[PDB]
Amino acid sequence: LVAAIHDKGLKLIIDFIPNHTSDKHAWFQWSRNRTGKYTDYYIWHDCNYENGTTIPPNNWLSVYGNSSWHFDEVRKQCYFHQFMKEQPDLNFRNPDVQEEIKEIIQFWLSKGVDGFSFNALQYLLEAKHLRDEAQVNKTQIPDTVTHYSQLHHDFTTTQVGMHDIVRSFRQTMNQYSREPGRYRFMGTEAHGESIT
């Protein structure tokens, strides 16, 4: 298909979403086992788990709405996920994960893909201190906050070093966009709330 597209004079760009993987990914199966360097590919933390009910490290919520931490039986720790529990978030603060996302960008550009569309980019980094958010309704009981819209998201979206990760993806795509007529396009999806 990539050959049939280039012969027509067209270009092909594909969706890329580097924030999370599935909990069936090989990286996560090794990480829960604490295997090798994969023990820190994901964001883990200690949490008390007794009688099926877990207290999370903070009040951070998922985007689809519930506690954003989930207990893992093999690791005996909680892993972070912005979206549903089937999507653990990669840990982009250690340099091992960024070299993996750098080889996937290189794998698809070698096949002739003409560029990418990066999704869920504001969720790349989170605050390291893991402090609780500020509720929208301050006089609300802290055990009924279960909706993503009931919090101010200052520690889970658009953190400080987030733009230097996206600028690093652009440099990896510059090694392939040097020959004239084969520039690699990079586009991102916009923040729904802000235009600045």
């Binding site: 050959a3 280039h6 012969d7 020959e179 004239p180 007529g181």
Partner: protein
Amino acid sequence: ELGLFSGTCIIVGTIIGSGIFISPKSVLSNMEAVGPCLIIWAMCGVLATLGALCFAELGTMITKSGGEYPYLMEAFGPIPAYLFSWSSLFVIKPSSFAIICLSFSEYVCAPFYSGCSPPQVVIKTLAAAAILLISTVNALSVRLGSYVQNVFTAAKMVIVVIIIISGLVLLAQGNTRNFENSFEGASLSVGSISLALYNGLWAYDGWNQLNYITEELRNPFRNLPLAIIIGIPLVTGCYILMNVSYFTVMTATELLQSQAVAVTFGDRVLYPASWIVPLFVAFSTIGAANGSCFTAGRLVFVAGREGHMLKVLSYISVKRLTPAPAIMFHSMIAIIYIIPGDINSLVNYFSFAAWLFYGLTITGLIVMRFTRKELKRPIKVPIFIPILVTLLSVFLVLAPIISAPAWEYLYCVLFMLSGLVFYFLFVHYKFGWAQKISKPLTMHLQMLMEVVPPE
């Protein structure tokens, strides 16, 4: 004297020029597939060998100083000899000078317009500045003509082996995707096959002017047909081994995008120093133009004896022994050619007129060998090679006009017949008033340009 190894080294360097850098785009835009456009470089490569072999016959048996003007005088009479002298001064030689200089500005201005095509005003203002500079240097001096020639034929061959070696190494690494499913969209037709033989044969231009080497060949009769049948077939083998080195790197859809084909190649394969291709090709292309301007005064001398062309054109300047009126008239016609047309509309216009006179010559070869002339011929070619060159050229001259008619052919036919009118009203009838328009013209020109008859 020059041996057989040097007997080919002159002819192979003569054939390979700036045609291999401009024609691939044009032969592929008519074959539409990698497979057939590879057999065109062989089919026209063989057709150029039988041409140069037939020209070896006339070059030995006639044995006159004129290039090809004698061969039409000896066979058909004085009207085709004059009609060729007319066209080779207004059509064949000026337009071949305009295509070489139009193809030198496609390679100088292609890097500065990366990703897209340059405007037409840039590739004509730069071509008009090359024609005037090439024709001015070759008029002020002769040493500077041959000063930079041996270096300009080095850069020509340095690139030819760089493209080939790179296109072979990449073929070992398995980059076979382009010619895997060849012939799939081949548009073979008398329309396309003819128009694609024009552009393929233009890369072989220079096989007719190959007879001068016999004078210094060690054993001409025994070695020249050998130096030809192993020299040119060595070059067609170096073209399909260079056109293959294009399709190994880029695809059939990206070829037609750029006019400078070798510039698209140097960016993809030679990234650290990719400026080497537009720099070296600009050297060789301006060197091949230097070879055209040198021979401009050649044919007008031999045709100036028989009173066919004006004798003032053969006059030489005294301060510098350079055919100044021949050159500045040879370039002034080229300037009028780069203005209306572009490379593709001139390769058709050139290879049309050039190929009817290429036919009339080798038909005169058999016609003289069949009935009229019984003189001895030192080297003899079999009878089946000339009948092929004429039956091929009669297809090349007549199929494009009927199947793919264009306005370029009309202006070509109107030029020769205009010379046919100049035959009767100026040289055939010799009117009285016709003289008094010539005599005051020549010496005033001599007065203004301080030129002198050669001998």
